[PDB]
């Protein structure tokens, strides 16, 4: 339903300048994800606990095996402090700056990931995998993008990077 | 700084009717407190984790040995579900309906505690223990209250009741 590409060339700044006039800017998002482990390894039991802050909106999410439960939280640092006082340890942290542009029913996310680099994620609101692929093919062609396609999440890419 | 009295007689309803004209009604509060235990007994280590909902405002609080860390939460049931999915077990629950009245710099709380009964808690904003005591003495005299004085919290009284 989405296509994520690591961008080798050109720069995200360069790519943003080319699509700036013809695309509709949505918003910019600053996001940090803090993952935790209970001292029942999440790696042992396929579970996850994540504190996410997106443009000031803080959410805590439990993920079950292959289920999600989410609550909004007033303060990321205090929730992180409470989790640490209860025995949970900070596992991985993912910091992202995302710029969202829109064209037709496609959302184009220019992602700058700390420690990881530059990515582009393209989403189709109600398109066929084939419709999504044709748009990505033309987008990558139109901007002469050298890419590396991945389906891994940014946490998976961070774990792979470590 | 406060004086809590279990009320034997008369009823809280009766007491409220007597002070209703001369006292200033502040507000009514519906409050539930859910205490948790990690599977590091809170009873072993003198710690506490409490989910409190007061008139719709939900807060999660960690209590340290004899320190408090608090975060506001969007939903009590989802936070309780997240805590349970992480291994925490529900220990005790305290449900209170409180009616707050004001006279001079004294706050009078008519408390109805499920499973426990009726209490009155009187607080002085900036008064001496002696000033607080004289007010409680006259209040208890003026309304012919038969009481039992306690410094125990409602969780302590619930634990004692069980």
Numbering used by the authors:
A (entry chain A), B (entry chain A): 6 to 44, 46 to 72, 81 to 176
Please give sentences taken from the publication describing this entry.
In this study we showed that the CYTH enzyme in crenarchaeote S. acidocaldarius previously annotated as adenylyl cyclase is actually a phosphohydrolase of the TTM family. SaTTM prefers inorganic triphosphate substrate over NTPs. The general topology of SaTTM is described by an eight-stranded β-barrel comprising the antiparallel strands β1-β9/β5-β4-β3-β2-β6-β7-β8(-β1) with three interspersing α helices and the C-terminal plug helix α4. The enzyme formed a dimer in solution corresponding to 56 kDa compared with standards.
Initial attempts to produce diffraction quality crystals using apoenzyme were unsuccessful, but crystallization was finally possible under a high-sulfate condition. SaTTM was crystallized as an open-state homodimer, bound with two sulfate anions instead of the ATP that was included in cocrystallization. The open state of SaTTM was crystallized in space group P41212 with one monomer per asymmetric unit. The polypeptide is defined by electron density for R6-A176 but lacks completely residues P44-R49 and Q73-R80 due to missing density. The dimerization of SaTTM was also found in the crystal structure formed by two symmetry mates along the α2 helices and parts of the preceding β5 strand. PDBePISA revealed that the dimer interface covered 875 Å2 with a CSS score of 0.32 and accounts for 8.5% of the total solvent-accessible area of one protomer. The dimerization is mainly established by hydrophobic interactions of residues from β3, β4, β5, and α2 and salt bridges between K99 from one protomer and E81 from the other protomer. The C-terminal α4 plug helix blocks the tunnel entry from one side.
